[PDB]
Design a protein around this ligand. Sequence first.
Ligand code: MET
Ligand code: MET
Lengths: 397, 392
Amino acid sequence: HGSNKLPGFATRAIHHGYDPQDHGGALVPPVYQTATFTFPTVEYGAACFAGEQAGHFYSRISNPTLNLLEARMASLEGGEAGLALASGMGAITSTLWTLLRPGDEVLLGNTLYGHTFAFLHHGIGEFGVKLRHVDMADLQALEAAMTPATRVIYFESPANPNMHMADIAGVAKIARKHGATVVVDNTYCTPYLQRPLELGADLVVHSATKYLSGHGDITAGIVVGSQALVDRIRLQGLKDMTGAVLSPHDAALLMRGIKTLNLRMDRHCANAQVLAEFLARQPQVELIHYPGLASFPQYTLARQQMSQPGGMIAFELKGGIGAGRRFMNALQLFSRAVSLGDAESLAQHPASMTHSSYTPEERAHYGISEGLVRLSVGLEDIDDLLADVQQALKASA
Amino acid sequence: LPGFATRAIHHGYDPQDHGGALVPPVYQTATFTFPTVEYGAACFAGEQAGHFYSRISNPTLNLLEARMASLEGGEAGLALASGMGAITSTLWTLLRPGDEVLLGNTLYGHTFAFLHHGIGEFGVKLRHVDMADLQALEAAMTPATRVIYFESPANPNMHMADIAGVAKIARKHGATVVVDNTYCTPYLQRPLELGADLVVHSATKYLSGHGDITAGIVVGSQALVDRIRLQGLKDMTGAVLSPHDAALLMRGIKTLNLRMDRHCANAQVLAEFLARQPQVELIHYPGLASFPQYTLARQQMSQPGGMIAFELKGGIGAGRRFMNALQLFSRAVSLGDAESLAQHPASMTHSSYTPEERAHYGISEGLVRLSVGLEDIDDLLADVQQALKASA
Ligand code: MET
Ligand code: MET
């Protein structure tokens, strides 16, 4: 019993931070689709530029619809404070622009989302910030790479595109010892499956464009961490260095999506578990990577830090670059698209799609096979998804 | 070649291409799918025209961008999540450590903050110069000068730049001229036609016109815009504009001409009034004969705009009393809305500063700025009148 008990995840996803009685009984929070806020007095106005008063002035810095979204994402991640941005890249760039100056070093996971890699190497890397890639699964190697200039450790777990994982608590422990800020891109899991801040990370970023929205109709990013770090990112990264302002309309849609997060994630995971087990037994499949199978290289780390194994599958077809094209073109229910976490099931074959400008030789040493297909398993009836994949495997043979 | 108002309503869109829809459907979608991997292939290389991901390209955003490009008379447009998004995406693309950016003497506050505390701390060099003083500008040019950036007119005294003269100087040195054209809009001033390479807008202001969206625009040559899209936007800021907000912005642009006409007509009346009030020490409105750059104003701007800055004799105290008395004008930052807005920096935005810190940025103790809106002028006059009375 007792009132000091934390409400369950689904309760907070739906209610946290909002009481209808503070807004004329409105069951759904009204949408503050306004660019600016006014003051009753110039002295009240002075107080919102001098930090004496809680309030609002300009939606780029702060907005009540965005604030609700932010406090709710903070609650779900177990962090102190949230920030909502125009995209995942908005969240990532606003964060790193704030935390890094010339001479600082960022240690990076070995593989990264493509635009993240490009921001680092062709963006902030070109402004005097040093980059080093390390296998975050090898704690001994991470420890060895730390220098007094190391300011930020940044990685995804599971990471694009191989679902390589890092031990978050282990990384946090090394960073505590040396003094570095740990940021985890937690897009693939959501706070429903994994909570890096509870494992000792300082900040988490999300492409809310993916599972958090869940419906493929908005682009959005989220940062969650300590009040001090999130405030700094808000007032420097967002306000001055990116201008990546989330529309209140889209923030409201994001909050709508978050109300079913637990139910969608349950189904994404149950469907992908069924597909992965089916695919592991098909003749055309040479290799499958799914965190829910014992064949997964980091099976125990997955079980240890993710409450469920996710909705992403990667597998290799027998027949190389060819067989991929044939599998892909055959799909009738899965769509050929590069994204993830939609209600609609998506499939990509990077060899003949994203990385098709390269030759057979070149995709290696970036972690990309010739028959590597990636699946974002959606919310459709599993039997239809099974049938679609089955029929497409046949055509790929 | 259709007129401005025709283009603001129609340019880039034929209903017959979208099932007869008079108003273009809103592409509120994050991702786009491909009929084949082959069609897919020719999008991540980029020589077959289509779509892949709303962060790079999207048809609602594309229409907005074409429309804005047509109105400014430029080759290409880019739509971003805010004015700051447009400015940072631009400058992050164009500058690297060791490059220098030449700046107008005063700038929008968050632009100043970005330059001085953001990109400036990454080894990019900054120098402020008066962009109306062509010889000070020429003398300020160095081999490192890669970008010239300013607003015209500029806060807080509505100081103008000689856009054409700046551009002549810039091309001797190959430098890129970027003009923040927020205050005028393409309806009143077109910097690309005066020789600028790129224009940026806080579309949050006049372009939207209705105070309900945050948005930015860049317009310029295809090659520069392409790079700002693929580098500044995609990689360095992630300032993605919602398709919902883009559609609202296009809705607002359909009345740009009509709104700007009323903003200016209202502001001209208010300026004439203010200019002869005894409480008012000094006034800055491009439409007054007393405006120091009256002539340059009229060469660049087809109308004198909807913004007024003036200085009350009684200093900071008069400013506070003026501001607090306003009943129709709202005390708020921002501008370019239907609703009239006013601010007094010395007691609002820059209050925590000191008298000489404020003077250093050209912020007078009695300086108030009016964003004159669309309300009946007799009502706006009455509000200003009683506020002036209260200011004593
Ligand atoms: C390239 S847009 C983002 C889509 C998805 N996250 C991917 O891996 O490609
Ligand atoms: C300090 S919030 C941004 C400033 C406001 N847009 C202005 O016109 O002054």
